[PDB]
Amino acid sequence: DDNINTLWTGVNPTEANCQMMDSSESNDCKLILTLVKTGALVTAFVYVIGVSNNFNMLTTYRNINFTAELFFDSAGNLLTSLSSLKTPLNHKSGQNMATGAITNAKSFMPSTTAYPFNNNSRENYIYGTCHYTASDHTAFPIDISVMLNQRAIRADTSYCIRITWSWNTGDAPEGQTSATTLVTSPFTFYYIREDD
Amino acid sequence: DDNINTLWTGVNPTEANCQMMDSSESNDCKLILTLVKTGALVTAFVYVIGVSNNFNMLTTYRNINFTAELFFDSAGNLLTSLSSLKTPLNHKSGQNMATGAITNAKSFMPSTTAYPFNNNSRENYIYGTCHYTASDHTAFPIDISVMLNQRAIRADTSYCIRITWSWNTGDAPEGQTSATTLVTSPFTFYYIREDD
Amino acid sequence: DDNINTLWTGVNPTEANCQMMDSSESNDCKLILTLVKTGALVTAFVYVIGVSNNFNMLTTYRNINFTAELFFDSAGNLLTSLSSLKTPLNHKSGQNMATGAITNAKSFMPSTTAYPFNNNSRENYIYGTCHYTASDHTAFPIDISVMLNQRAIRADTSYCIRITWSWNTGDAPEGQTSATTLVTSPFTFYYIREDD
């Protein structure tokens, strides 16, 4: 069964499943996250679809960054209370999430052996790029940094994935006319996965 | 059988399988394309090998862009008449194309759930970069755009993939005298795929 | 068995497995390399973790380049005497290398059909980017070149893979004092895989 090789958020959820900004009253966006086991690695594919106004209007600032923090327990279960993503992940079931248990969730996690915790003498950072398309159809470039693991906030935080989208320009992607909706193009990164 | 997880053009076809330029009267290049299923995603691997003289000589201009348009039917069979690629895809058979029927061709296609159709409703694409190597061995950078399912053109056009290669420079990558075959380095992008 | 689809160095070997610099008297770094079969392609995942002082002190210079040269025989076995990597690859066994024989090693190799030997205006180099993280956590960008096949050196050198990391900047990545071990973020590239 190939569907269990995916651990994902589902494609275009009915409602916003992610609270990117602390200032928001509830989930302010749709986080689309797909994790695929591909040999010794995880293929990670992620992007964002703006939902709440204050989030979407971030396009109007010249200097912006927002982070999705995803925290997992010892079994590879998403800790919804601590994480930016507020609905747990599941296997592929069409364009949707399956509803049953997760098979070998742990082997979707970033290797603690390759990406350790609280080790000043090693690094866990992954850097990439993605884009936003403005109303004027110009490709606005978005920086993406990825930090794996690192310090664990809670006693049960056994694995970490943090994704920061940032940008810096003399000009803002968008005006105050608004009537614009923020969406990042997809970013794909790769990491080594933990065993069961 | 792993061979059915790939849908491609085959490696290095005898002669040009793609008519990239509107001005060409026939196939003017070899479009090398690999679509590999990787769980809920498709890994897409693409580059071009110039054949016709007029096509190879694009290296001599300061402002150049070319697009391969791929249209697919409801079963996911390439609509060759409408497409730049004039030869259908089939599974991996060694370094070449297999000759039988295609297994689950639709599950290679870009998801209409993730990528619905824009018929004047919206506007969008996905961005990357690749390079050309000049006779002086210097890496000339080429921009790549990818548009999924933006617009359906004929009644049987169930899926769209458009890929545009462009560059803009004060100098042309090759001189009039230093003119050789146009070849791109491979570009990889990823999309969420439709189900069977 | 999914483990045989992976061919790697293992995670964080106890001792340096790679001699990057010719000036080094023994292995001066840890080469982390993972090759995963992905249909008709191989997903190649590579980065380095510095070990020797001479190698770690590379962080203090403004213009640096180093290359890992990998040569394989007709059976797809790494030729250690010739290669920068001095320890053979094996399949996944947890966070480590398998110890037995290698299953279908040749199919992890770069296609001679796609990437021929010393053939003019044919096949191509691969260019990419990755990063080094300085003490202030600022991302220093590293250019990567990848060369497939191309020139063989010894009579049993049936396959070739070269990886060049280079950089050129107005400032050195680290200060003289704040310098620490040199570690690259992972670079992921793709090639068409030779068959069995």
Structure token pair of residue A97: 């999430």
Sign of CA dihedral B127, B8, A36, B148: positive
The span from the CA of B69 to the CA of B112, in Å, is 17
DSSP C90: B
- Which has the closest alpha carbon to A38: A2, A71, A14? A2
The rounded Cα A12 to chain-centroid distance in angstroms is 14
**Residue A196: C-alpha distances to residues A76, A106, C101 (Å):** 10, 6, 24
What is the DSSP annotation of A137-175?
--EEEEEEEEEES-S-SSTT--EEEEEEEEEE-SS-S--
- Which has the closest alpha carbon to C68: C33, C41, C119? C33
Strand order in B29-38's β-sheet? B6-8, B29-38, B41-50, B187-192
**What is the largest distance, in Å, between two alpha-carbon atoms of chain C?**
51
**Chain A contact present for C185, CB below 8 A:** yes
Torsion of CA B13, C6, C17, C131, to 10 degrees: 70
Distance in Å, alpha carbon of C39 to nearest chain B alpha carbon:
6
The data reach a resolution, in angstroms, of 3.2
The span from the CA of C129 to the CA of C144, in Å, is 5
Q: What was the structure determination method?
A: X-ray
Q: Are C140 and C173 in contact (CB under 8 A)?
A: yes
Q: Are A32 and A22 in contact (CB under 8 A)?
A: no
Q: Are C157 and C68 in contact (CB under 8 A)?
A: no
Interface-testing mutation among B164, B192, B195, with chain A (most A C-beta atoms within 10 A): B192
Please identify which residue in the block is written with the tokens 């292995």.
C27
The rounded Cα A88 to chain-centroid distance in angstroms is 13
Sign of CA dihedral C85, C86, C89, C95: negative
Residue B22 neighbours by CB distance under 10 Å: 8
Q: Are A40 and A192 in contact (CB under 8 A)?
A: yes
Contact A12 B114 (CB under 8 A): yes
The span from the CA of C133 to the CA of A25, in Å, is 35
What chain B holds in terms of domains, given with CATH numbers, is: 1-196 (2.60.90.10)
The span from the CA of A7 to the CA of C29, in Å, is 35
Q: Which residues contact C184 (CB under 8 A, 6 or more apart)?
A: C47, C48, C130, C131, C132, C142, C165
The span from the CA of A5 to the CA of C110, in Å, is 26
Sign of CA dihedral B93, B95, B97, B102: positive
**Minimum-distance CB partner of A41 among C45, C139, C185:** C45
Structure token pair of residue A85: 């993503």
Sign of CA dihedral A33, A36, A37, A42: negative
The span from the CA of A83 to the CA of A18, in Å, is 9
Distance in Å, alpha carbon of A157 to nearest chain B alpha carbon:
27
The span from the CA of A86 to the CA of A82, in Å, is 9
Torsion of CA B99, B105, B108, B110, to 10 degrees: 130
Contact B37 C39 (CB under 8 A): yes
The span from the CA of B83 to the CA of B86, in Å, is 6
Distance in Å, alpha carbon of A154 to nearest chain B alpha carbon:
32
**Residue A77: C-alpha distances to residues A40, A87, A117, B163, C115 (Å):** 20, 11, 18, 38, 43
Contact C124 B47 (CB under 8 A): yes
Q: What is the phi-psi region of residue B120: left when phi exceeds 0, alpha when psi lies from -120 to 50, beta otherwise?
A: left
Chain A to chain C, count of Cβ pairs less than 8 Å apart?
62
The span from the CA of A95 to the CA of A13, in Å, is 10
Q: Which residues of C59-87 are buried (b: 16+ CB within 10 A; e: fewer)?
A: bbeeebebbbbbbbbeebbbbeeebbbeb
Strands C159-168 and C63-72 turn out to be: antiparallel
The DSSP element (H or E) to which B65 belongs, if any, is strand B63-72
- Which has the closest alpha carbon to C145: C125, C122, C160? C125
User: C186 contacts in A (CB within 8 Å)?
Assistant: 126, 190-191
Q: Are C16 and C52 in contact (CB under 8 A)?
A: yes
Sign of CA dihedral A58, A59, A60, A62: positive
Work out the burial of residue C103: count CB atoms within 10 Å of its CB; fewer than 13 is exposed, 13-18 middle, 19 or more buried.
middle
Q: What is the phi-psi region of residue C123: left when phi exceeds 0, alpha when psi lies from -120 to 50, beta otherwise?
A: left
- Which has the closest alpha carbon to A35: A141, A194, A142, A143? A194
Q: Are B136 and B179 in contact (CB under 8 A)?
A: no
**Chain A contact present for C139, CB below 8 A:** yes
Q: Which residues of B109-130 are buried (b: 16+ CB within 10 A; e: fewer)?
A: bbbeebbebbeeeeeebbbbeb
Contact A123 C133 (CB under 8 A): yes
Q: Which residue of A has its CA nearest to B196?
A: A94
Return the CA Rg of chain A.
17
Distance in Å, alpha carbon of C69 to nearest chain A alpha carbon:
23
Q: Are A31 and A97 in contact (CB under 8 A)?
A: no
Structure token pair of residue A141: 């470039």
Q: Which residues contact A120 (CB under 8 A, 6 or more apart)?
A: none
Work out the burial of residue A105: count CB atoms within 10 Å of its CB; fewer than 13 is exposed, 13-18 middle, 19 or more buried.
buried
The rounded Cα C180 to chain-centroid distance in angstroms is 21
Strand order in C187-192's β-sheet? C6-8, C29-38, C41-50, C187-192
The span from the CA of B145 to the CA of B46, in Å, is 12
User: B125 contacts in A (CB within 8 Å)?
Assistant: 133, 185
DSSP A111: P
**Minimum-distance CB partner of A192 among C11, C38, C43:** C11
Residues 149-168, chain C: which have Cβ within 8 Å of A? none
What is the DSSP annotation of C97-165?
E--SPPTTGGGGSBPTTTS-SS-TT-S--EEEEEEEE-TT--EEEEEEEEEES----STT--EEEEEEE
| CA within 13 Å, CB half, C33 | 24
